[PDB]
Design a protein around this ligand. Structure first.
Ligand SMILES: [Zn+2]
Lengths: 62, 101, 151, 129, 204
RNA sequence: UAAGGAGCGAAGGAGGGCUAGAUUAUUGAGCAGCGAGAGGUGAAAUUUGAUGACCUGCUUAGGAGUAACAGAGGCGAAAGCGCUAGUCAAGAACGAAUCCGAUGAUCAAGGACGUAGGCUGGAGGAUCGAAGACGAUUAGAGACCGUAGUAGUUCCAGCAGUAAACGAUGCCUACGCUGUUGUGGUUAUGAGCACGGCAGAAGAGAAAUCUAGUAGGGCUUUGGGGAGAGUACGCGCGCAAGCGAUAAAUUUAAAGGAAAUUGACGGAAGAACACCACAAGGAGUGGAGUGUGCGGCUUAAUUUGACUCAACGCGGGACAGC
C-alpha cells in the first residue's frame, strides 16, 4: 500500500559506495520533528524534496 | 646488525615470561612481545536501534556491550594490517591506538 | 553441489542409450542467488582451471557479485561406443548419463541433451528427436525401438 | 490487551554455522529449532547472514502457531579455549525477530569463558597458509 | 502426530519478592501424581531483579535463581537457589591502572543450608593527585580481605533465607563494606558477585 | 673505611618447601526434551548421525590449569616464579652515637644447582600430540591442510649436563653532564640511599651505534686468513643417548668476513592518477555466407619477415605478364 513521507534535504556530506555512486544526506521530515541520515543515489541539490517509504530506517554512520 | 634497541619486546630485568596463543593461527607468542588489540562491540547493530525502539517492552532500554582483548603474532598482525612497515626514523614513534567496535 | 543426470522413460527394443556430454544449463550463483542471464554450454571437452589449478569443464564469473562459479562433468559412462559415444549406465528403469559437480553455483535446469540409441538389433539411431516425450523407429525387419514418457 | 507470553531463544554463532532454538523458561522443553545449514545448499554459505535470516523465519512461524508473543534472547560464540567473538549471522537473527511481530524482553551474552584452560589445538607454530 | 497438543501448562510461583507469578512450563500429560512430581520437581529457572520488582531501571544488573519444590493444582512452588551479576556488569567494571580485590567464604543458615559467597572490590584514584595509576599494595589488600570476611560473617551467618534474600535485594553488604574499609584505602564497586547453594539438608 | 662479618628496630616482594580449601572451563558417562543434519576449509573430501547426532536441561567422574586486572611493574645466583588461607627456615635493602678488628679480591684441581627433550623404577591418564595410518592438492608429495592416533606432556625417588642458557657485552673497585619518569624505605619536606626505564649532550668508534667516555688498579677465561675440524687416536665420566677435552696429512687467494653507499629485483607496504582503466550509459566483435591476412598439411614450387601490450587489410603485400 502507498504509505509515503516527504522530507527536505538540508545537507550533503560524502560521495560513497563502490565507484562513488551514492551521497550521504541529512533530511528533515515535513510534518514531524524527525531528522534522519540517509544515502541517496541520484544527483541531489540542497533544498530538494524526496519521498521515503520509511521514517525510521537509518544510516547511522552519517 | 641490531635493528631495535629493545629487541622488539618489552621484557627488562626478567628471565622468562608467560606465553599466549594467537587469535588467527593459535601459534605461541611471549606475552611481552604479542600485538594487543581492544574491542568494545554492541550486541545490537546500529542499523537495528530504530526497530528496537518499537520492539522493546521497557520504557527505555540500554543495549548490552561485549568486551574483548585479542592477541596476535607478528606474521598475523602484518598480514591483517594492524601494523605496517615504517622508515628508519618513524620506527621510534610510540602512540596508543584506538579501541575498536 | 553434485547433480546426477538421469535419462528416464519407458524403453522398448533398446540395448543402450548414449549421451553427448554437452549440456545447455541454467546456473544460479550460490553467493548472491542471482540466475545467470543466459544459459551456458557445459561440455566434457571444454578444459578450464580453477584458481588452484583444478580441471573443470566450466568457469564463469557472476556478473553481480563477481564470485567465480565452476562446474565439472564426471561421465558415468561404462564404455565408449565407437570411441565417440558415452554409453549411459543402466540403473534399474533409468540411465545414469553423468554427474555434474557445481562449486559457487547451483544447476537449476538442464535444457536438452543430444541422445543416441543403440537398438537390441545393433542399429544406431543418432541424434534422436522426441515429439511430446515420445520417440519410435522401425527397422526393415519390423523390429520396433521406442522411448515413451521421456524425462 | 493480551499479556506477554514469553519463550527463551538460544543462538549460537560460530565461523562455520548458526543454530537457533526456542524453549520454555525452564530450558527443559523445546518448541522449535533450525540452523543455517538446514536451508542452504553450499557449505560455504552456512554462516551467511542470508542463511541465518531464512532459518529464523521458520522458527518465528512455528512459535506464532504455538501461540507465543514475546522472547528473551541468550547469545554466544564457541568459547572455552577457542574463539570468543560472536560470528556473522548472530546479529541478523535478532533483527529478523523484530520484523516479525515479536516483543523483545532482555538480551544477554552468555559465552563460556575459562578462568584458566586446557591446551588449545594447533601446535607451537600454528596453522601455516 | 502433534505431540504438542498433549501437554499441560503449570504456573510458576515464588516468595519474598513483590511479584508472585513469573510464567508457566509444559509437561506431557500423565496419569499418576507421583510421575508429575518426578517430572516437574528438580527443574530450574532464572529471573532478573527488574522483572520481579518495581524499581529503578538501573537495578537490571542482577539475576535470581529458583528450583521447583512442590505441586498444588495449577501451581508449582519454587525456592531460592542462588544469585548472580550479569556479564555486562562484571566485564565493564574492570579497568587498567587499578587493583581488584577478591574473596570466597562459606556460611550456614539457621535452616541448615550451606552457602558459598564470592565478593569483589576495586581500588580508587583520589582527586587532586597526578600519578597515572592507583594500585594497592599487596599487604594492604590482605587487610581489606580480612575485614570483608568479618562483615560477611556478621551479616549472613546463622540467619533465615527470608532474611538473606532481602539483604541481597537491598544490597546491604556492599554498602557496609564501603563504609567499614574506607579507613584502610579508598574503594569503589563493592558487590556480592555470586551466591551458590552447596548442601541442602536431608529433610521431609 | 662511601673494607668485611655478627646483631637491633619498623616495614616490603609471582623468592622457596609443606598442610588444607576454591570460581569456571575441556572431555567421558547417566537420564529427559526435539526429530535432521553436524564437523572442517581458500574451496572441499576422509569422517560421524533414526542403536536419535547437534543444541537445551538436570546429575555425576576424573586429571591439568590459574583468563581479564597485567605494565619497557616486582622477586631470585642463574635456570626460573602469577587463585585463597595457615605454617617452617634463611636472605636483600633502609634507619641509627650496637659489637668484633683485617677476618678481604679473584680463582687451576675439587664440589653443588641447571628450561626443554631423553633414560631407570613406581603412581596415574582430562587436553594436546613425535611415530604410524588415511582423505585431499600436485608431474610427484613421502610434507604444508583436514580426520584420527601412540610414546610422551602430570606427580614421587634418581641419572644425565646440552641451548640464539643473549642485553650475543666476566668479577671486584674508581672518576665522571643534564632533563624526565618509576619501585621500596627515610625525611629540616629542601632532599637523600638502593634497584631501574627513557631522552638529549660531550667524548669515542671503520661505521651502525654506545654495557663501547677517562686510565700501566687487581685477578681468571679466551682469539690469531679460509677449509679439513670441534673431526681421528688415546684417556675420563654415563644404564644408554652421548658429553667433556683435543691433532696431523692434504688443499686454497681470498672468506654468502664486518658496516655503511648506488642500482637491479620481490610473490611488500603507502599515497596519487586515467572512458586507449573501471563503475553508470551507447555501438559492436566472438555465431552464418563472403572478402582478406596467419598457422598446419599438400606440391615441381606453393619464396619470405614479424609473435603479450608494442606479430596476424602489417612489410604503402588490391600477385594474369611485370
Ligand atoms: Zn598468528
Amino acid at each position: 500500500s502507498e504509505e509515503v513521507y516527504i522530507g527536505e534535504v538540508l545537507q550533503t556530506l560524502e560521495k560513497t559506495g563502490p565507484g562513488g555512486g551514492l551521497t550521504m544526506c541529512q533530511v528533515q521530515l515535513k510534518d514531524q520533528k524527525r531528522t534522519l541520515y540517509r544515502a541517496i543515489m541520484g544527483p541531489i541539490a540542497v533544498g530538494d524534496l524526496v519521498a521515503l517509504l520509511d521514517c525510521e530506517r537509518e544510516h547511522r554512520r552519517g | 646488525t641490531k635493528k631495535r634497541s629493545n629487541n622488539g619486546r618489552s621484557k627488562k630485568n626478567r628471565g622468562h615470561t608467560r606465553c599466549v596463543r594467537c587469535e588467527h593461527c593459535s601459534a605461541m607468542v611471549p606475552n611481552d612481545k604479542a600485538i594487543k588489540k581492544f574491542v568494545v562491540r554492541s550486541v545490537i547493530d546500529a542499523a537495528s536501534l530504530d526497530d528496537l525502539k518499537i520492539a522493546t517492552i521497557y520504557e527505555e532500554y540500554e543495549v548490552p556491550k561485549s568486551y574483548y582483548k585479542l592477541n596476535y603474532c607478528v606474521s598475523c598482525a602484518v598480514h591483517i594490517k594492524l601494523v605496517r612497515v615504517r622508515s628508519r626514523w618513524e620506527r621510534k614513534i610510540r602512540k596508543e591506538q584506538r579501541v575498536s567496535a | 553441489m553434485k547433480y546426477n543426470v538421469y535419462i528416464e522413460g519407458t524403453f522398448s527394443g533398446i540395448q543402450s542409450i548414449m549421451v553427448e556430454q554437452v549440456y545447455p544449463i541454467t546456473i544460479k550463483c550460490s553467493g548472491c542467488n542471482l540466475v545467470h542471464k543466459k544459459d551456458v554450454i557445459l561440455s566434457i571437452d571444454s578444459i578450464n582451471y580453477t584458481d588452484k589449478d583444478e580441471k573443470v569443464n566450466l568457469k564463469v564469473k557472476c556478473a553481480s557479485c563477481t564470485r567465480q562459479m565452476y562446474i565439472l562433468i564426471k561421465s558415468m559412462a561404462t564404455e565408449l561406443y565407437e570411441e565417440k559415444f558415452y554409453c549411459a549406465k543402466k540403473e534399474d528403469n533409468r540411465y545414469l548419463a553423468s554427474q555434474l559437480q557445481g562449486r559457487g553455483c547451483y544447476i537449476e535446469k538442464i535444457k536438452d541433451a543430444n541422445i543416441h540409441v543403440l537398438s537390441e538389433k545393433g542399429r544406431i539411431y543418432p541424434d534422436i528427436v522426441f515429439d511430446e516425450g515420445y520417440w519410435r523407429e522401425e527397422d526393415n525387419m519390423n523390429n520396433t525401438s521406442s522411448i515413451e514418457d521421456f524425462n | 490487551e493480551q499479556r506477554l507470553n514469553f519463550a527463551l531463544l538460544f543462538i549460537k554463532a560460530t565461523k562455520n554455522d548458526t543454530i537457533i532454538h526456542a524453549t520454555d523458561l525452564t530450558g527443559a522443553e523445546t518448541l522449535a529449532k533450525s540452523s543455517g545449514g538446514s536451508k542452504v545448499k553450499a557449505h560455504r554459505d552456512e554462516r551467511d547472514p542470508y542463511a541465518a535470516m531464512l532459518a529464523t523465519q521458520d522458527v518465528a512461524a512455528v512459535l506464532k502457531e504455538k501461540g507465543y508473543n514475546a522472547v528473551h534472547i541468550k547469545i554466544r560464540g564457541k568459547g572455552g579455549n577457542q574463539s570468543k567473538i560472536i560470528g556473522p549471522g548472530g546479529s541478523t537473527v535478532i533483527r529478523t525477530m523484530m520484523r516479525s511481530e515479536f516483543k523483545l524482553g532482555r538480551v544477554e551474552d552468555v559465552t563460556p569463558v575459562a578462568t584458566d584452560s586446557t591446551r588449545k589445538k594447533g601446535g607451537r607454530r600454528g596453522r601455516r597458509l | 502426530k502433534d505431540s504438542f497438543l498433549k501437554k499441560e501448562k503449570y504456573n510458576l510461583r515464588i516468595e519474598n519478592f513483590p511479584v508472585r507469578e513469573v510464567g508457566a512450563t509444559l509437561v506431557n500429560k500423565q496419569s499418576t501424581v507421583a510421575a508429575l512430581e518426578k517430572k516437574l520437581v528438580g527443574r530450574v529457572f532464572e529471573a532478573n531483579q527488574g522483572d520481579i520488582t518495581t524499581s529503578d531501571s538501573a537495578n537490571c544488573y542482577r539475576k535470581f535463581s529458583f528450583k521447583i519444590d512442590s505441586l498444588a493444582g495449577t501451581n508449582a512452588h519454587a525456592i531460592f537457589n542462588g544469585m548472580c551479576l550479569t556479564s555486562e556488569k562484571i566485564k565493564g567494571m574492570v579497568k587498567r591502572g587499578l587493583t581488584l580485590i577478591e574473596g570466597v567464604k562459606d556460611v550456614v543458615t539457621k535452616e541448615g543450608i550451606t552457602l558459598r559467597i564470592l565478593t569483589i572490590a576495586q581500588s580508587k584514584k583520589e582527586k587532586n593527585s597526578t600519578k597515572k595509576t592507583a594500585y594497592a599494595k599487596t599487604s594492604v589488600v590482605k587487610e581489606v580481605r580480612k575485614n570483608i570476611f568479618r562483615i560477611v560473617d556478621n551479616e549472613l551467618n546463622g540467619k533465615d533465607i527470608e532474611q538473606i534474600v532481602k539483604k541481597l535485594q537491598m544490597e546491604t553488604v556492599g554498602k557496609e563494606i564501603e563504609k567499614e574499609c574506607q579507613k584502610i584505602i579508598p574503594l569503589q564497586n563493592c558487590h556480592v558477585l555470586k551466591v551458590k547453594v552447596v548442601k541442602r539438608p536431608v529433610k521431609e
